[PDB]
Amino acid sequence: DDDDKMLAAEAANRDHVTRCVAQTGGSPDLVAHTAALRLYLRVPHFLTEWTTDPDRRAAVSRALALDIVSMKLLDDLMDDDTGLDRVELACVCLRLHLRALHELESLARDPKAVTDILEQDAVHLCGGQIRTKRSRATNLREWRAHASTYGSTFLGRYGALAAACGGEGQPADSVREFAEAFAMTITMADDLTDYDRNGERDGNLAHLMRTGAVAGQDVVDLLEELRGRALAAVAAPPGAPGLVPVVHLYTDDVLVRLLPRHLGEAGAGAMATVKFKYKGEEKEVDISKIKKVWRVGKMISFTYDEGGGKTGRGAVSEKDAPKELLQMLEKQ
Amino acid sequence: VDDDDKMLAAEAANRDHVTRCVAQTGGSPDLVAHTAALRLYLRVPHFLTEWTTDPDRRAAVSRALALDIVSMKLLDDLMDDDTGLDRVELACVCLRLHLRALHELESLARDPKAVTDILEQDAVHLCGGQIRTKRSRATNLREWRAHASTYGSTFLGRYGALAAACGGEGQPADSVREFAEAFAMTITMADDLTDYDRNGERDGNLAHLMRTGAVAGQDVVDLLEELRGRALAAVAAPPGAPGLVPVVHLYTDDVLVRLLPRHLGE
Numbered sequence: 001d002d003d004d005k006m007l008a009a010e011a012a013n014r015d016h017v018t019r020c021v022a023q024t025g026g027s028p029d030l031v032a033h034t035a036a037l038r039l040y041l042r043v044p045h046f047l048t049e050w051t052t053d054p055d056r057r058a059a060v061s062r063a064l065a066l067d068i069v070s071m072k073l074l075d076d077l078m079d080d081d082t083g084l085d086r087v088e089l090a091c092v093c094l095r096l097h098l099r100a101l102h103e104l105e106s107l108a109r110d111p112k113a114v115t116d117i118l119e120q121d122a123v124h125l126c127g128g129q130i131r132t133k134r135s136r137a138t139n140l141r142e143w144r145a146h147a148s149t150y151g152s153t154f155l156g157r158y159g160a161l162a163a164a165c166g167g168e169g170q171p172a173d174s175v176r177e178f179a180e181a182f183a184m185t186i187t188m189a190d191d192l193t194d195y196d197r198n199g200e201r202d203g204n205l206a207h208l209m210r211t212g213a214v215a216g217q218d219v220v221d222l223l224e225e226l227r228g229r230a231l232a233a234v235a236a237p238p239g240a241p242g243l244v245p246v247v248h249l250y251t252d253d254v255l256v257r258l259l260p261r262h263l264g265e266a267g268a269g270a271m272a273t274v275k276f277k278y279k280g281e282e283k284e285v286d287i288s289k290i291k292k293v294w295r296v297g298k299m300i301s302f303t304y305d306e307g308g309g310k311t312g313r314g315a316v317s318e319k320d321a322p323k324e325l326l327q328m329l330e331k332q
Numbered sequence: 333v334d335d336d337d338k339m340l341a342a343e344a345a346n347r348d349h350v351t352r353c354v355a356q357t358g359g360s361p362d363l364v365a366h367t368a369a370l371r372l373y374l375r376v377p378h379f380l381t382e383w384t385t386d387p388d389r390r391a392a393v394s395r396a397l398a399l400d401i402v403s404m405k406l407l408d409d410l411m412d413d414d415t416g417l418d419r420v421e422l423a424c425v426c427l428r429l430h431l432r433a434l435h436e437l438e439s440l441a442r443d444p445k446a447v448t449d450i451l452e453q454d455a456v457h458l459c460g461g462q463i464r465t466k467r468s469r470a471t472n473l474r475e476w477r478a479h480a481s482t483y484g485s486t487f488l489g490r491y492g493a494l495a496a497a498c499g500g501e502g503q504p505a506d507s508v509r510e511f512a513e514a515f516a517m518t519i520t521m522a523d524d525l526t527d528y529d530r531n532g533e534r535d536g537n538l539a540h541l542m543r544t545g546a547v548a549g550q551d552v553v554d555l556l557e558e559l560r561g562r563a564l565a566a567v568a569a570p571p572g573a574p575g576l577v578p579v580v581h582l583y584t585d586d587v588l589v590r591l592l593p594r595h596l597g598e
């Protein structure tokens with residue numbers, strides 16, 4: 001049912017946005033383009049998760065949807081590659097944005113709160129976007145510094161806005177920290193998806209990965225860092241435990257579905273190995289060399305490839321058996 | 333000492349506030365010079381704040397208005413994509429200026445909410461209006477003035493309403509707006525009749541219609557006189573802004589004396 005709320009909020013946000021876009025005169029095209037922004041349309045649901053009143057929640061949620069979409073249209077306008085009419089984009093972008101300011105301001109805890117948040121880091125956001133397209137990233141550090149502006153800062157502002165407009169019990173800093181961490185996970189997913197869906201290369205993370213400039217394991221660590229930051233934010237009282245599955249879902253999808261498309265054969269960080277003594281020795285073998293493996297009580301017995309058609313042998317306690325070895329077990 | 337010295341200083345102050353903001357947010361020299369070349373856009377806020385007595389408040393409202401008007405102008409350059417400027421810079425500087433203006437205007441308004449109320453009020457009329465203008469070009473004075481009332485009149489009308497909401501006591505709000513709406517149409521015509529040669533502009537362009545006979549000189553003269561009268565009236569309502577009277581005459585007469593002759597029928 002939390003999943004049913006999510007869907008219904010996304011649908012309500014989609015509705016609010018498309019009606020507003022058609023009434024301003026945008027084509028059925030642009031209308032389809034915006035209704036297609038499913039995550040952008042659902043994110044407002046996550047940002048408003050700390051809002052106790054449901055009537056305020058739905059109102060804040062769609063107001064955020066209006067502005068997030070408007071900013072996405074602005075981005076479409078700067079790249080001019082959607083096929084969409086430049087004029088309807090411009091005009092629809094502005095219109096949604098003014099509607100959003102009106103709605104958010106009508107729900108804010110203070111009359112200056114909305115414009116303070118939008119102004120506070122406008123230079124960081126705007127100059128940051130310019131710099132992102134002016135100097136393509138060539139390593140993880142650069143890719144990350146750029147993504148913290150058009151991804152993190154970008155969504156963080158909406159996080160601050162959700163807290164500013166969501167009545168009582170909103171832990172301002174936490175909603176915003178959730179937003180900035182979640183935005184980066186989402187931005188990464190996007191780069192690794194759009195490498196192909198879109199044909200993107202310069203400054204793109206999937207390209208940097210396929211190119212060697214950034215290593216799989218460092219991407220896993222950043223994803224893990226972002227997961228932890230988001231979980232902590234979501235844990236600060238009064239808590240938004242409903243966001244826990246959400247954070248896992250997105251992080252895990254990047255790890256399980258998207259990374260492999262750019263890392264290949266076991267793109268972790270190191271070929272797993274098994275250590276053991278055999279005939280007074282000290283041996284270590286790559287799970288890749290391992291042929292057969294079976295269990296005798298709590299011991300794990302196996303055979304492997306030494307060099308040529310030279311069959312090696314070994315047995316270890318399961319406690320010293322790397323997960324990878326234990327898997328060939330159940331897989332044998 | 334005179335009003336001309338006040339106008340010139342305001343324009344300069346507006347230009348500098350604008351260029352400093354464009355440069356700090358990453359705008360390049362071509363984009364910075366481009367915003368400094370929008371002369372009338374930087375000057376018009378001086379006219380709209382003419383009812384504001386306190387000179388500090390006036391200078392502050394005037395430059396905040398200049399930020400947003402420049403912003404909308406960059407967004408327009410962005411949709412037409414014909415200036416040869418970087419679309420990312422235009423877009424980003426556009427947003428930055430607009431957000432700074434919201435912030436400066438809300439800090440000056442009696443009631444902050446009034447700033448978003450005014451901008452929402454006729455957002456559809458202005459944005460849907462700008463789409464149709466570009467969709468289907470004007471073919472006669474009727475159609476031309478209907479379109480200009482959106483991207484010209486409503487467009488400046490809003491800033492007129494903002495100048496009143498942010499300019500303290502006095503301000504006869506409906507009149508400031510009426511002045512802005514009529515004056516905006518006069519300069520939009522002016523611009524259209526300069527833009528002919530300076531843009532390779534034909535469809536829906538008033539000068540094109542004039543030269544091809546679709547529009548009659550006397551009707552244009554009439555429209556200009558109607559606009560002058562409406563503007564003179566707006567500035568004579570109380571409290572009154574006498575300083576705008578010669579301004580209304582200067583721009584109207586310039587269109588009648590210098591621009592129209594450039595466009596006889598055939």
Ligand SMILES: CCCCCCCCO[C@@H]1O[C@H](CO)[C@@H](O)[C@H](O)[C@H]1O
Pocket residue numbers: 369370371372373376401484488516519520523
């Ligand atoms: C109503 C607020 C301003 C709208 C009318 C301004 C149109 C005339 O403004 C003119 O625009 C030209 C083209 O960009 C510039 O080259 C000129 O310097 C400027 O004076």
Ligand SMILES: CCCCCCCCO[C@@H]1O[C@H](CO)[C@@H](O)[C@H](O)[C@H]1O
Pocket residue numbers: 071072074075125126129150151154183186187190191423424427
């Ligand atoms: C100056 C304008 C800044 C706003 C542009 C970025 C805001 C939305 O832009 C979007 O950002 C996403 C990350 O959230 C990217 O993954 C998408 O490719 C991009 O469309």
Ligand SMILES: CCCCCCCCO[C@@H]1O[C@H](CO)[C@@H](O)[C@H](O)[C@H]1O
Pocket residue numbers: 090091094404405407408409458459462483484487519520521523524
């Ligand atoms: C969607 C609304 C954004 C654009 C609104 C109009 C912004 C100003 O647009 C300007 O207005 C002038 C007024 O005469 C015209 O002459 C100029 O050619 C035009 O660029």
